[PDB]
Amino acid sequence: GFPCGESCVYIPCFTAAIGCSCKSKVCYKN
Length: 30
Description:
The chain is mainly beta.
């Protein structure tokens, strides 16, 4: 629920393969 410092508007969260989750086209981790 807290932004990783990445986005996924156009390009998914590379950090989503770790612990982030694209959420509202921003990467939110928990």
